[PDB]
Symmetry: none
Subunit: 61 residues, 6 copies
């Protein structure tokens, strides 16, 4: 492999924008919760995963 | 493989935009929950997955 | 491998913007919670994962 | 006039984006020239104009 | 006029973005020239203009 | 006029961004020239103009 004159963008995330005004979030009775916003994962060579969101709960009342 | 003059964008996510005004979110009785927004995963070479959202719950009342 | 004249951006996340005005967040009765904002993970070579959000809870009442 | 609870955006320009890669501009024999990019003009109360581009030339050869 | 609880954005320009890579500009034989980039003009109350680009030239050869 | 509780942004320009990589500019034979980048002009009350770019030239050869 060789690159003489070149621009290579491999495994890239850019220009991700989030805008929010007058919003409302309520999680009332949750055993375990994962609430997130932007999640950016850039990776050229991987063996596992990129983003893992796990939630295991128990709401007995 | 060789690139003499070239632009290669392989495995890329860009320009992802989220706009939200006067919204409302409620999760009332959830065992385990995963609530997210933007999830961007760029990866050239992978062996596993890219984004894993897992939720295992129990709402007995 | 060789690069004579080249720009290589591999495994990159940039220009991620979050804007929020007059918002409201409430987590009332949660066993374990993970609330986040921007999560940026750039990594060229990985063996594990990139972002792991785990929440295990118990809401008995 | 009165505003009790309100959001008023009057006379506004926002989120104007220009992206350009590998472009080419040539103005060879021009008497007078006006070459521009983004031109944003926000103004609530005006008596004149907003943007005036004037070019008066003479190419005799 | 009165504002009890309010957000007023009148005469505003924001979030104007210009991105340029590997570009080329040439003005070869111009009497008078005006080459510009971003031009942002925000003004609530005006009597004149907002942006005036004037170019008067003479290319005799 | 009165503001009891309020945020007023009148006559404002903000968040103007310019990004440029590997670019090229040439003005070869120009009588008078005006080459600029970002031009931001915020003004609440004006009688004249906001931005005046004037170029008057003479290329006889």
């Amino acid at each position: 492999v060789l690159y003489v004159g070149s621009k290579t963008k491999e495994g890239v995330v850019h220009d991700v924008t989030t805008v929010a005004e007058d919003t409302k979030e309520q999680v009332t009775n949750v055993g375990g919760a994962v609430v997130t916003g932007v999640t950016a994962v850039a990776q050229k060579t991987v063996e596992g995963a990129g983003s893992i969101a796990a939630a295991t709960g128990f709401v007995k009342k």
